[PDB]
Paper text:
The individual McpH-LBD was generated as a his-tagged fusion protein, purified, and crystallized in complex with uric acid. No crystals were obtained for the apo protein. The 3D structure of McpH-LBD was solved by molecular replacement using an AlphaFold223 model to a resolution of 1.95 Å. McpH-LBD adopts a structure typically observed for dCache_1 domains that is composed of a long C-terminal helix and two α/β type PAS folds that are termed membrane-distal and membrane-proximal modules. Well-defined electron density was obtained for bound uric acid that enabled to precisely introduce the ligand model. The inspection of the molecular detail of ligand recognition shows that uric acid is sandwiched between two aromatic residues, W140 and F167, establishing π-stacking interactions. Furthermore, three of the four N-atoms of the purine backbone establish a hydrogen bond involving amino acids D156, D169 and Y121. Two of the three uric acid oxygen atoms, that are not part of the purine skeleton, establish three hydrogens bonds with R129, N154 and G159. In interpreting these binding interactions it has to be taken into account that the protonation state of the N7 atom of uric acid is unclear at present. Out of ten residues forming contacts with the ligand in McpH, five showed consistent conservation across all sequences collected.
Numbering used by the authors: 7 to 251
The structure:
Amino acid sequence: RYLVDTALPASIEAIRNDIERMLGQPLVAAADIAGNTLLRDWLAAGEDPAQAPQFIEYLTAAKQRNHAFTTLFASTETGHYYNENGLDRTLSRSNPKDKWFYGYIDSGAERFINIDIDGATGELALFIDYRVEKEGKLVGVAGMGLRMTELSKLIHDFSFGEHGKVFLVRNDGLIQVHPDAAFSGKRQLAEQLGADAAKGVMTGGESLRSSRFSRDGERYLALGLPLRDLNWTLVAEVPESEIYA
Ligand SMILES: O=c1[nH]c(=O)c2[nH]c(=O)[nH]c2[nH]1
């Protein structure tokens, strides 16, 4: 019942819903690549070179149509990793840079969301990966990557008022997307808010969470609202004097 009859809860929800739409496009598009039954069959049947150019054309089309930084699939049998330009490299369990792939397939989880360094380019990206399965048997992984600098830019444009800031935080407290790109995937929520307020907005149900915190004697309000499709939380920070406008 805090701020219920204020415009603030609806304003945060409108931001939350816009962020879910924009993240929803790569979620959906990456799922389409992994679920593509023609690709599943090509991976299961051993990556016939005769059809490889046409699957690279397909990844290129999906990247451009969906404005992704990169699109990709990898075979769990050969370790071969393909992106929109072709066969890039072979993964290996003994290489720490490939931990993401083996951890994910070992996990069996239906989806992987991960901030990581793109192996082909060295760029910080948000990756979305799904299992590729045939008759129950894992044959690959596929998905797409988004450039972290672009995501920070998108989160920054949702700033509001004089000092209203918005963050996307994994439900463990690590800030995934920060308006200042330097801190995306690197800053803990406690660094931004203080431990009490971080705990406050990260603890709760599916309704708006809130907590007060002080920043050099300036009183602030912290808000939290879960995303429905990701295990992430939208966190907003606004000075108390800005609550109304
Ligand atoms: O978590 C990751 N998912 C990927 O799809 C990918 N691709 C890549 O090069 N590195 C990573 N990391």
